[PDB]
Design a protein around this ligand. Structure first.
Ligand SMILES: CSC[C@H]1O[C@@H](n2cnc3c(N)ncnc32)[C@H](O)[C@@H]1O
Ligand SMILES: CSC[C@H]1O[C@@H](n2cnc3c(N)ncnc32)[C@H](O)[C@@H]1O
Ligand SMILES: [Mg+2]
Ligand SMILES: [Mg+2]
Ligand SMILES: [Mg+2]
Lengths: 289, 297
């Protein structure tokens, strides 16, 4: 239905007047779960593609960008992250990146939709390999609700959500950020999908402003990824540790570590550069008017 | 091995969809508010439309060249990366740049005394003046000498003549094909003065890493210093594009601008993308591209 004449087209009122389309090789899955519409297809040139409510979540070809950054930005900004919470991350990709750190002993994942877990294991095996980690404790539920049952529990919280629509709506609210503050340990750090500086600079400054009322350290970084709207996405980074410097990794990686972790996107120079914004965005977020 | 092909420019159900064999299996579509121009010149097919959300859009042989909303990224970077990597650029050559936007950025440098542009297609110049006035304003500078012709042939005519050469081209296709060839890079080397620098549209690291590496290899046999930088721009394929940078000066360090700009200079030049930090970060590539371009195998 979103597939016509051998192409899938992604449209959304959050990025009006533009669309990415990916040519379809083979439909793999299309079924509605309790929470959302779940579409999976083998594309011609991007490998397998997961689509939720018409919005591309990942492709095999470029997923490593978002997966490595959302994991390593917060992890390399904590001097010893031992207990990690992931909210969302149904494809298993973030889990896969997180567990590569020896410091990490325990990762709890809270995913709302078990059908996403199932189709990922089947059609996104290079990402859902994450689910086979001995470091994982898996919960099926609303992350916003699960956050309330945890206080002072986590070194790092990662919110790997789709856009501020449907089941992910509340994950972008100031109330949810308060819940994360409470679920973090006294020196804990968070990283949430924070949207696109070429599309949502208003949301970005607004989130930044409310986060600054909750946390001593707030930062915005971004990464490039062909199949997200406008070809990139950002991350909201917050710490309860007043000493956190997100822009200079507290855990730099050697070239050998980058090689051993099989990283395709992230390294310490990339981490530094991710905070260097286009002048329009730097000005909007930092300068006074 | 075959020649590259793009889908012929067409508007269908109120959307323009860009397709090309240089980025197979993916497409950007922009919703159309108003069709403004669609005619073939003596060189190429020219589509101009007013989009719903990106202002006016220039399309050449089915390939998006610019949109009013995001043009400043490519325009500012292709201009300032070489200019701020030269201690005193006085004489500038632009090949292509029919929309006039690169001219607009180059002339903001007081050091720049003369800009020569060689653009092949007189019709692009006219549609840009009408439909892209914020870019085509570049044409109304007294610093400009304009030629209409093929930039490859034009390059043969100049020796030891320019501090900076910018090739602001579309893709290695149609009239632009020769602009990506080693023989063209040799011609530019000759057209540059002894310590001159060049910057060319150098394609996308998420799409064209093969071409990027190949160009890099042949440029390293010609110039002491060769680099690759990229900028983000939502309406080029995969949301970004890069730049080939070469210098005949062995002392040139492209990542560290030899001409840093103060915040005041950035304000004075009305820059919306480029600044000296952005300059530095634009050479920091994702691990896969850093590896492909720098590690020996
Ligand atoms: C594919 S990565 C994004 C994941 O976030 C999940 N998700 C969306 N909303 C919520 C929520 N409120 N709590 C937990 N997970 C969510 C989706 O089901 C998806 O698998
Ligand atoms: C819109 S910016 C790119 C410009 O490059 C121009 N162009 C393409 N091939 C050549 C060439 N061989 N010499 C000069 N300009 C060219 C196109 O006509 C376009 O206006
Ligand atoms: Mg090292
Ligand atoms: Mg010179
Ligand atoms: Mg200053």
């Amino acid at each position: 239905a979103a597939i016509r004449e051998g192409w899938f087209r992604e449209t959304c009122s959050l990025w009006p007047g533009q669309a990415l389309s990916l040519q379809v090789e083979q439909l793999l899955h299309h079924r509605r779960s309790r929470y959302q519409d779940i579409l999976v297809f083998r594309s011609k040139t991007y490998g397998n593609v997961l689509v939720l409510d018409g919005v591309i979540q990942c492709t095999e070809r470029d997923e490593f960008s978002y997966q490595e950054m959302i994991a390593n930005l917060p992890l390399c900004s904590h001097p010893n992250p031992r207990k990690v919470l992931i909210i969302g991350g149904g494809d298993g990709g973030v889990l896969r990146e997180v567990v590569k750190h020896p410091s990490v002993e325990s990762v709890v994942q809270c995913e709302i939709d078990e059908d996403v877990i199932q189709v990922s294991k089947k059609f996104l095996p290079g990402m859902a390999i994450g689910y086979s980690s001995s470091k994982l404790t898996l919960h099926v539920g609303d992350g916003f609700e699960f956050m309330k049952q945890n206080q002072d529990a986590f070194d790092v919280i990662i919110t790997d959500s789709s856009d501020p629509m449907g089941p992910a709506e509340s994950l972008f609210k100031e109330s949810y950020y308060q819940l994360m503050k409470t679920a973090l340990k006294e020196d804990g750090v968070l990283c949430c999908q924070g949207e696109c500086q070429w599309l949502h600079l208003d949301l970005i400054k607004e989130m930044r402003q409310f986060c600054q009322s909750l946390f001593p350290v707030v930062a915005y970084a971004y990464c490039t990824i062909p199949t997200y709207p406008s070809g990139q996405i950002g991350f909201m980074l917050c710490s309860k540790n007043p000493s956190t410097n997100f822009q200079e990794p507290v855990q730099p990686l050697t070239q050998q570590q980058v090689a051993q972790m099989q990283l395709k996107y992230y390294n310490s120079d990339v981490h530094r550069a991710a905070f260097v914004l286009p002048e329009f965005a730097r000005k909007a977020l930092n300068d006074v008017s």
